[PDB]
Structure 1
């Protein structure tokens, strides 16, 4: 603790895993939805969590905001730190879209800079992250 309330919180929602993947980012304090990604027909939970963080980085950079990002995903936080999403999802025609988005997110990380702290939301102490889908 404590929660850094002046922050952006992100989370993934899915119908199946692998399955339909979406994500959103919210103001940690107010819950206002700041962005939402159109559902992607096939992806994994961790790919969605990764895309959500990267989108948060791009969102905050465009707005000249120094707020941190919270995610509850140990995996996605690491993948962003590494600038490499180490997903097991097969590459085929069905997964081409998510893989294009993941590849492009990695490419963005490799061509841009940011100071945004990426923080682990401590679900066991604080409850569900504010961007949770309730599924």
Structure 2
């Protein structure tokens, strides 16, 4: 009943214009709201692809810094894709969506070839309100 935000964490989120549409994501320090990583907007992608990329990017980021901090996401889909090490997107694969699909292929490749200690936690929106990395 008293699950509480772990402040010493990284929170990730996606923002879009359309879905599918222009996608971006960022990772923030949950405690300060400081931006730790982001990607330049991607012309075409889906919310779920974005959420997935943001978690994997977070894994690589924390791994390189030898960090024990957990990552929070609000995306049940992206969390499942990361644990499965496979994104199951329906987005068409063509010249238009080549960038996002390249990134998703790369993220899967990394997952399938590395280990990591980072706990990946569901952000409890119903208990805590909106995630801290939210675009709004």
TM range (shorter): over 0.9
CA RMSD, 1 decimal? 0.5
Partner of 1:98: 100
In the TM superposition, what is the alpha-carbon distance from 1:36 to its structure 2 partner? 1.1
Measured in 2, the distance between the counterparts of 1:36 and 1:95 equals 19
- Note the residue ranges of structure 1 that are not aligned, 5 or more in a row: none
Offset, 1:31: 0.6
Report the TM-score when normalising by structure 2. 0.97
How many residues are paired up? 134
Q: Matched residues in 2 for 1:51 and 1:5: separation?
A: 22
Does the alignment pair 1:124 with 2:126?
yes
Shift of 1:2: 1.2
Per-residue deviation at 1:16?
0.5
For residues 20-48 of structure 1, what are the alpha-carbon distances to aligned partners after superposition, in whole Å with 9 as ceiling and x for unaligned? 00000001111111111100000000000
In 2, the alpha carbon distance for the partners of 1:63 and 1:38 equals: 22
Where do 1:1-135 residues align within 5 Å?
1-134=3-136
Q: Secondary structure at the match of 2:12?
A: strand
Distance in structure 2 (CA, Å) of the matches to 1:52 and 1:101: 11
Shift, 1:117, TM fit: 0.4
In structure 1, distance between residues paired with 2:69 and 2:16: 26
